[PDB]
Design a protein around this ligand. Structure first.
Ligand code: K0X
Ligand code: CL
Ligand code: CL
Ligand code: CL
Length: 258
């Protein structure tokens, strides 16, 4: 119970809603006297039982220090647990991807940059997988852009992102995350398309059971599509690890000009 992970509610000031569960901007008064801009995620919970069993991961998650993994700053209570995260003015990668297809928004994202996004995420997931942390919700909307434009994975602790074995059952290995990473790669390569156009979410298990997979995008290198298709092999054992994927993508990026 020695959890120097909780933060006194009084050190926290809450502002506008950034998204809806419900996410609000905030200011965190830090221990050096300065205030930090934060994002505050309201985790609506069932307090029939036990609020606890929730400060467990958060204390492990606070021990995470990888630049491609969002940092947990701590948790506050109002009984309303609030998860305190850094604020990233550039927002989530999915939206950045769409914006980039509008004038005024980011310029067309070249492939090198798109791949560097996939490497960041692969690096972040590799860190988490080496500490046997499952994500269970990986998608471009839950990846965030840091002020230096490196990507970090977030919302650790959806139908079209769920591996096929996890639809029949509801079990999740890290190889189920690998599958979602492959979908996320497709999200990135398509500059934000929704997965499986023409297929409804109710059609998805039968779609996948008959071995249909996400189609290859128009400009996507054959080599990148092979990497992403490997994430969807029917046997989780045939899928690569995140450490294999991360090096594959790093190599392909290096095999491209600047
Ligand atoms: N709802 C989904 C995805 C989006 C998460 C909510 N958005 C933000 N949160 C973050 N910080 C900045 C933003 C933001 O929206 N930046 C734009 C802005 C510019 C300028 C400005 F003035 C205000 C906001 N950190 C928390 C990240 C992860 C929390 C939940 C996981 N992901 C979700 O649950
Ligand atoms: Cl407040
Ligand atoms: Cl689209
Ligand atoms: Cl498709």
């Amino acid at each position: 119970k020695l959890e120097d992970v909780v933060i006194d509610r009084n050190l926290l000031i809450l502002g506008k809603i950034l998204g809806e569960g419900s996410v609000m901007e905030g200011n965190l008064k830090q221990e050096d006297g300065t205030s930090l801009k934060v994002a505050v995620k309201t985790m609506k919970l069932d307090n029939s039982s036990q609020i606890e069993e929730f400060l467990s991961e958060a204390a492990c998650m606070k021990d995470f220090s990888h630049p491609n993994v969002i940092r947990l700053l701590g948790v506050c209570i109002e009984p309303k647990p609030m998860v305190i995260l850094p604020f990233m003015k550039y927002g989530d990668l999915h939206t950045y991807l769409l914006y980039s297809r509008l004038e005024t928004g980011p310029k067309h994202i070249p492939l090198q940059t798109l791949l560097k996004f996939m490497v960041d995420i692969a690096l972040g997931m590799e860190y988490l997988s080496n500490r046997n942390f499952l994500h269970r919700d990986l998608a471009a909307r839950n990846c965030m852009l840091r002020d230096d434009m490196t990507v970090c994975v977030a919302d650790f602790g959806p139908v079209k992102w769920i591996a096929i074995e996890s639809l029949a059952d509801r079990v999740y290995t890290s190889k189920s995350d690998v599958w979602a990473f492959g979908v996320t790669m497709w999200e990135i390569a398509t500059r934000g398309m929704t997965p499986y156009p023409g297929v409804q979410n109710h059609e998805m298990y039968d779609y996948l059971l008959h071995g249909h997979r996400l189609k290859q995008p128009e400009d996507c290198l054959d080599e990148l599509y092979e990497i992403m298709y490997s994430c969807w092999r029917t046997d989780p054992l045939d899928r690569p690890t995140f450490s294999v994927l991360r090096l594959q993508l790093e190599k392909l990026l290096e095999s491209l000009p600047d």
